[PDB]
Design a protein around this ligand. Structure first.
Ligand SMILES: OC[C@H]1O[C@H](O)[C@@H](O)[C@@H](O)[C@@H]1O
Ligand SMILES: OC[C@H]1O[C@H](O)[C@@H](O)[C@@H](O)[C@@H]1O
Lengths: 145, 145
């Protein structure tokens, strides 16, 4: 009914990004990265029962990390770093996502300040918000209890 | 499950600590600290309507930090560091708590890996879990959406 909204982690560059329909079920996340997180996109079923394909936020290019999820496989842990890269002061530089199936996905290069959200009980990540320009300046999460 | 349970951050020393009645409303937090977090205690109204006085977890001593909260003032941001201190490898070394009234409370000395939970919308911290022995080895939070 009410999602928990946590973040964002990263700098103040770029423009605010968000979703207008709260997610109910996260189906996929696609990240592009080099030495920093270059884009994020994600696909979910809204609380309205409709499917949304969000993004990409950021300029992309680099190498892809494609995370596919569903009714039983949930994101249970997300962490990363944010800091200086490519002559910018504070960018999301690295992301690590762990699902309930013990599938681990990593993007970028650890560099800067840590953040981490390990979820217990039934909590899981269902969506994102943040800031983007050419890169992902900052990232935040929506958490389904 | 109505609360979001996040964490813990810190090492694997000490013994697991937790609460059994889910919190509805957090009324106060008491922290003792030196170069590390030496104890935490808190009191809350449970979902059963009863008041609970939890802790102290940890051995305490040092300087006290007393955080008082209520129906309008609650914890919107909690952050900290964990890592080596004294002759130990991974302890909660520092905590910063910010309330909806823009009251900020700090305990310990920043040292080690960062963690941070900045809550948006209606989310707020209502309780804690973690690990303790002589000190607070690790700390986690319960979040009310
Ligand atoms: O996204 C990284 C960077 O991209 C562009 O240079 C601009 O949008 C900046 O404001 C932003 O910080
Ligand atoms: O709490 C810090 C330290 O205190 C005690 O001596 C023991 O419980 C340890 O296992 C613990 O790591």
């Amino acid at each position: 009914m009410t999602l928990v909204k946590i973040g964002l982690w990263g700098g103040n560059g770029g423009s605010a990004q968000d979703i207008s329909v709260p997610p109910k079920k996260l189906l996929g996340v696609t990240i592009y990265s080099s030495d920093a997180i270059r884009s994020i996109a994600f696909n979910y079923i809204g609380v309205d029962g409709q499917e949304y394909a969000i993004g990409p936020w950021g300029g992309g290019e680099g190498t892809s990390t494609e995370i596919k999820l569903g009714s039983s496989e949930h994101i249970k842990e997300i962490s990363g770093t944010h800091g200086p890269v490519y002559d910018l002061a504070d960018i999301v530089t690295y992301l690590k996502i762990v699902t309930s199936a013990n599938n681990t996905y990593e993007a970028g290069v650890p560099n800067g300040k840590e953040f981490s959200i390990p979820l217990q009980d039934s909590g899981h990540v269902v969506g994102f918000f943040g800031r983007s320009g050419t890169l992902i300046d900052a990232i935040g999460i929506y958490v389904h209890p």
